Design a protein around this ligand. Structure first.
Ligand SMILES: [Mg+2]
Ligand SMILES: [Mg+2]
Ligand SMILES: [Mg+2]
Ligand SMILES: [Mg+2]
Ligand SMILES: [Mg+2]
Ligand SMILES: [Mg+2]
Ligand SMILES: [Mg+2]
Ligand SMILES: [Mg+2]
Ligand SMILES: [Mg+2]
Ligand SMILES: [Mg+2]
Ligand SMILES: [Mg+2]
Ligand SMILES: [Mg+2]
Ligand SMILES: [Mg+2]
Ligand SMILES: [Mg+2]
Ligand SMILES: [Mg+2]
Ligand SMILES: [Mg+2]
Ligand SMILES: [Mg+2]
Ligand SMILES: [Mg+2]
Ligand SMILES: [Mg+2]
Ligand SMILES: [Mg+2]
Ligand SMILES: [Mg+2]
Ligand SMILES: [Mg+2]
Ligand SMILES: [Mg+2]
Ligand SMILES: [Mg+2]
Ligand SMILES: [Mg+2]
Ligand SMILES: [Mg+2]
Ligand SMILES: [Mg+2]
Ligand SMILES: [Mg+2]
Ligand SMILES: [Mg+2]
Ligand SMILES: [Mg+2]
Ligand SMILES: [Mg+2]
Ligand SMILES: [Mg+2]
Ligand SMILES: [Mg+2]
Ligand SMILES: [Mg+2]
Ligand SMILES: [Mg+2]
Lengths: 81, 150, 129, 144
RNA sequence: AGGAUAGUGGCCUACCAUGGUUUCAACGGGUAACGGGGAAUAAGGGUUCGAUUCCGGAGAGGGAGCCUGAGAAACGGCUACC
RNA sequence: GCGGUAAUUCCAGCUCCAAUAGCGUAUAUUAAAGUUGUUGCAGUUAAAAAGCUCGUAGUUGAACUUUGGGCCCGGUUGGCCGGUCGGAUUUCCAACGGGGCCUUUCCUUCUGGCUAACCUUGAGCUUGGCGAACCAGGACUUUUACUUUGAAAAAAUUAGAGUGUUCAAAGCAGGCGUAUUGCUCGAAUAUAUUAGCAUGGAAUAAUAGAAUAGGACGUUUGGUUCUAUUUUGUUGGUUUCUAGGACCAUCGUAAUGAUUAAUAGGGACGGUCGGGGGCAUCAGUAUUCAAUUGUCAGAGGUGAAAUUCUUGGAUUUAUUGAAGACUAACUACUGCGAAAGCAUUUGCCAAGGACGUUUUCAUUAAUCAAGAACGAAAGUUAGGGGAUCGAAGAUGAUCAGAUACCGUCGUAGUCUUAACCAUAAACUAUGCCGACUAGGGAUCGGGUGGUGUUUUUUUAAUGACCCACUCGGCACCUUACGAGAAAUCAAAGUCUUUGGGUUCUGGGGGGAGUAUGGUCGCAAGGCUGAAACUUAAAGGAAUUG
């Protein structure tokens, strides 16, 4: 290329890049406000949770862990936070 | 790197730039500290406490929610273990492998990996002795290790 | 493993200049790297550069003109006296008219001409021309 | 990193490594083991006097057909037997027998010279009269 | 602690303790090794040499002992053995 | 290399050349020699990366803590001017280096004097501020390395200033007058490592500090203990206060006190991944043998044969059974493992990498003499097992011979258990760690995204595929910017523009991995490892024949 701006790259390229290999490294993970049917009592859930998270109101189940992102249960409504 | 292998993996967390965060935030520092102490009184280690606060509650990290780390909080509230956790887990692994090797005497791969694990234990014990969280005269021996776990 | 970050920085700058690029990214941005680049800048060998503050150690994005043939590091940082300066410069500079041997003295990091002026010596870091 | 250590406190390694790799040389080894003083029929000397025992017609190496007119010499200080070459046309006729000759090396640092197998020395004098001078008829050999 | 010494000191003795050195090369062996100042050759770095005009040390065929004296374990001074 | 009857090389003559009162030869040493390699070698194939990993003497080791801005003072260079007759001043634009002060900046002070520079101001040179600028003594006082300056480092020698040995090597002399009486310049200076001494600096690199606060300040407040002069009138014994250490206690003052979280490392967690390992188990045909069975004369092997088996029925067919080994095809420029190595099923046992992670510790790390684990095959010991193939051996041929290749038999071995051995073209003939530098596509594992395709229950979630992306691997294609002696190489590059860290090995070829001595081993042998002597070429890669 021989000339380029390494301080103001494109957001497309920075999202294409690996999280550590960006200009400033930071997480691609996020949190969710999750509603279970019935008990509103919204629960904060991490995307890559590692635990079978369940609401304090009842042991319903909220998210099952996977190798990456957690799989939220079928009857649930989530809000990116 | 991977001192005892040829692996060259980069699988690590990439924590954020914001040291004060995240502006959607629940529980105060006191609530988070009492949750930490509650999870510690039932026997969880700092890593498990962190994972649980992270995924079940919204706690990006205790060092920014609070001002202190989890092991410091536990040391100040009297829940510090007798040996550090990484060393505990290594001793546990070595105990399991030595038991397996007694039940199976021809597992030379297991002998090899046990030598690796013991080398690692001794390196960490060297560090902990020269920073004085283990005393000198602390020495790892399998015989007593089996209950040095507890 | 990684021992001298200055060496990696100057290797990257050298390779960028050999390849004709006009910019290069340095990781992880030590103070001595900053002062070294400041010397090279005061003498006109690189141009502007920008320190990106991640909370770990830093990055640096340097702009490069084509004036630089070799920026180098001398590892180990040998202890250098006031005549050994001349001996070194003879050994590792192209001519007696241009080029700068760089040495960390108690009076800061500098080039050897400034070190002769201030009459102080020190440890050798590298060279540039 | 080119092998060798570069660190500012790594000089002992470099020293002892040099010692070993110096033993890998030839001249250093011969100088320090003392082979000249312990071997090498001289005593590391430039010259040596000896007594003639026999004249020899050593045949040359190939490709070369010739006979080289040498002599056997018992050295006075060591008693060692040594073959020496008499360099010139007809100069073997001044070395009759039981002479006291002076020998030097030829110039190859103990090796054998040319087509002459096994000889490392040459005759410079007979009875103190300089084969060169005898051959150019400047001087004459004593009676006895 | 004492003796001895011009004086310190296992220098020697009595009693007691069990120490001291060592891969940062101890101890042992070899040196065609007195040590330096210095010499040769050296772009720079270095390699080799240094019995020898100066300084220090040691010796007087080998060993040992001693008189005299401020000073010698003296040898162009004694004593003995080889 | 010359010399074998036309010698530019021998013996001579002539001529010529080189150094020249000197020239040659021998030995040793220095340079040449970057053929010792710190500067500064090489290690795929030329000599040389230990079989692989771990690890103790060592070497090396991520980033971070006062920066920036101002105000002044006076030095060195310059610069018109030359206000002097090719010498210099001072008011000057600038540069170069020092010191001081202010910006949150105690940049150690306790007792005192000079009180210093002094609000000190007497009318335009006077009666009276703040301890170092002059000293005393003290409370103390993080430790080094590094560098500057200085002292020190005998003289001679070395470099070098001046100068008549007539030049020069040398020496330290000498030179100048009216030479009647005398005068006078010198005999410098520099170098002299490392160690030690003092001194300024304080970056670079280490080191320490306040974290179950026995922490700092301190005008405070009790107290405990120790030392004590001047005086009380004296020598002494008691004291009271008083002055000075030290320590403990409680009140007070403090933004009271813990660096990041390295695309370093360890550990945890999550769902996976794998012909990774150990134990047990299951299956598959095939091979050999045996039994029964049918038919019948050749079958086996070879290039061709013969040895061999065959009317006592060989080979062949069918049906069973036993044994032990092996794990075909699927099987690939695919996978796991430190390497050696690992391929039937299932179960158990423990382990591991990669990925993911807004989890945890926090520099714990890299490489590593000594030291240790593992280490194909063969081989050794002892048991078991023993189908196959088969070092030895026997045989049939071929052959001039053939105790070899080919054929038929066949012990040991090949398998296994418990120990030994510790070697290999154990090879990528390429040490490990780390950073950077060119394009292209495919593939293994993980993950993200996509109204994507398909299957399910048109539908969902999955799973399998497609597209894009990414981390980590096994590799591959093209090019050479570069490297290389080239063959070739994305590392064998970033190397005379020579230094990222670290271990090992080599220094012409042979003799020689021999002899000897140690050490390990039951042994076989392994590890360590010369010398004599010999030699001008051995060798690598390419080129045309
Ligand atoms: Mg390692
Ligand atoms: Mg890495
Ligand atoms: Mg260093
Ligand atoms: Mg020849
Ligand atoms: Mg005494
Ligand atoms: Mg005593
Ligand atoms: Mg001697
Ligand atoms: Mg002598
Ligand atoms: Mg004497
Ligand atoms: Mg005599
Ligand atoms: Mg005597
Ligand atoms: Mg005499
Ligand atoms: Mg000739
Ligand atoms: Mg002639
Ligand atoms: Mg040279
Ligand atoms: Mg070489
Ligand atoms: Mg070969
Ligand atoms: Mg080779
Ligand atoms: Mg290898
Ligand atoms: Mg260190
Ligand atoms: Mg010092
Ligand atoms: Mg990290
Ligand atoms: Mg896991
Ligand atoms: Mg398995
Ligand atoms: Mg039949
Ligand atoms: Mg199969
Ligand atoms: Mg596979
Ligand atoms: Mg080998
Ligand atoms: Mg090899
Ligand atoms: Mg690399
Ligand atoms: Mg993929
Ligand atoms: Mg890939
Ligand atoms: Mg792979
Ligand atoms: Mg050589
Ligand atoms: Mg050789």
């Amino acid at each position: 290329v021989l000339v380029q701006d390494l301080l103001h790259p494109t957001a497309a390229s920075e999202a294409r890049k690996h999280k550590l290999k960006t200009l400033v490294q930071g997480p691609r993970s996020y949190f969710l406000d999750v509603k279970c049917p019935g008990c509103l009592n919204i629960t904060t859930v991490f995307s890559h949770a590692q635990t079978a998270v369940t609401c304090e109101s009842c042991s319903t189940i909220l998210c099952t862990p996977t190798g990456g992102k957690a799989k939220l249960s079928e009857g649930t409504s989530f809000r990116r936070k | 790197g991977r001192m005892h292998s040829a692996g060259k993996g980069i699988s690590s967390s990439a924590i954020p730039y914001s040291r004060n965060a995240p502006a959607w935030f629940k529980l105060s520092s006191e609530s988070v500290i009492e949750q930490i102490v509650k999870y510690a009184r039932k026997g969880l280690t700092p890593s498990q406490i962190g994972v649980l606060l992270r995924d079940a509650h919204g706690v990006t990290q205790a060092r920014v929610i609070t001002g202190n780390k989890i092991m410091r909080i536990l040391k100040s509230n009297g829940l510090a273990p007798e040996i550090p956790e990484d060393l505990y887990y290594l001793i546990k692994k070595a105990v399991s492998v030595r038991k397996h090797l007694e039940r199976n005497r021809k597992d030379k791969d297991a002998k090899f990996r046990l030598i690796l694990i013991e080398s690692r234990i001794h390196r960490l014990a060297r560090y902990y002795r020269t920073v004085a969280v283990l005393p000198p005269n602390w020495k790892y021996e399998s015989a007593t290790a089996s209950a040095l776990v507890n | 493993t990684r021992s001298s970050v200055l060496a990696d920085a100057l290797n990257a700058i050298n390779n960028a200049e050999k390849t004709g690029k006009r910019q290069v990214l340095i990781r992880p941005s030590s103070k001595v790297i900053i002062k070294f680049l400041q010397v090279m800048q005061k003498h006109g060998y690189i141009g502007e550069f920008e320190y990106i503050d991640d909370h770990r150690s830093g990055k640096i994005v340097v702009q490069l003109n084509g004036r630089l043939n070799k920026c180098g590091v001398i590892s180990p940082r040998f202890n250098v006296k006031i005549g050994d300066i001349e001996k070194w410069t003879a050994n590792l500079l192209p001519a007696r008219q241009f080029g700068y041997v760089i040495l960390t003295t108690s009076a800061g990091i500098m080039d050897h001409e400034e070190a002769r002026r201030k009459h102080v010596s020190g440890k050798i870091l590298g060279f540039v021309y | 990193g080119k092998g060798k250590p570069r660190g500012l406190n790594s000089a002992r390694k470099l020293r002892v490594h040099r010692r070993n790799n110096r033993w890998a040389e030839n001249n250093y080894k011969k100088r320090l083991l003392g082979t000249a003083f312990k071997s090498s029929p001289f005593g590391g000397s430039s010259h040596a006097k000896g007594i003639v025992l026999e004249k020899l017609g050593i045949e040359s190496k190939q490709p070369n057909s010739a006979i080289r007119k040498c002599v056997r010499v018992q050295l006075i200080k060591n008693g060692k037997k040594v073959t020496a070459f008499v360099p010139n046309d007809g100069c073997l006729n001044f070395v009759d027998e039981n002479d006291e000759v002076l020998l030097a090396g030829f110039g190859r640092k103990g090796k054998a010279k040319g087509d002459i197998p096994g000889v490392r020395f040459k005759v410079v004098k007979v009875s103190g009269v300089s084969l060169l001078a005898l051959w150019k008829e400047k001087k004459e050999k004593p009676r006895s």
